[PDB]
Amino acid sequence: AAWGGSYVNDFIDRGRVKKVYVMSEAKYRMLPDDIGDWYVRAADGQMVPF
Amino acid sequence: RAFSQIKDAMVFAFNLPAIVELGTATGFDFELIDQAGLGHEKLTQARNQ
């Protein structure tokens, strides 16, 4: 859902059902380097880097 | 004649045509179609209009 993105929910824009896509902003997912910028909330409550 | 005046709610009594699904000669079936990104409110307004 960071680098790939994900279709999540559906919403009603002007009365027409369209999709809901969540993905990273551009800049944080371009360069191998940006892998570092992403963390996971572990079982405890700590973020672990990629 | 019975259910028009001496009733509380509308009750029509009728006979079904023999060809069971086509046009009532002098009679049409109009569709008022909302086209732009409008709202059900605006459409009804158009309808009563």
Side-chain angles (χ1 to χ4, degrees):
Chain A
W3 296 64
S6 174
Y7 168 75
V8 173
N9 227 29
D10 294 320
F11 75 102
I12 306 166
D13 184 20
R14 291 175 284 221
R16 182 166 161 69
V17 37
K18 316 178 186 188
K19 302 188 179 304
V20 182
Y21 266 60
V22 184
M23 193 185 175
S24 148
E25 186 143 342
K27 53 192 284 187
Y28 319 103
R29 56 156 196 85
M30 317 278 300
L31 305 155
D33 295 7
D34 298 354
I35 281 301
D37 274 28
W38 301 90
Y39 297 85
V40 196
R41 149 144 74 83
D44 47 58
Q46 324 160 0
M47 320 307 289
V48 194
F50 268 157
Chain B
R1 184 163 268 267
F3 314 137
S4 55
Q5 267 167 334
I6 69 166
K7 292 305 299 145
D8 43 300
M10 206 61 267
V11 180
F12 285 132
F14 66 177
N15 180 258
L16 56 164
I19 288 164
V20 214
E21 33 271 348
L22 227 175
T24 55
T26 179
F28 66 89
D29 200 314
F30 193 101
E31 216 73 9
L32 199 54
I33 282 186
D34 160 39
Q35 227 96 353
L38 304 188
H40 161 86
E41 194 166 331
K42 234 109 70 72
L43 215 181
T44 295
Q45 181 104 20
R47 177 202 90 241
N48 281 326
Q49 186 170 11

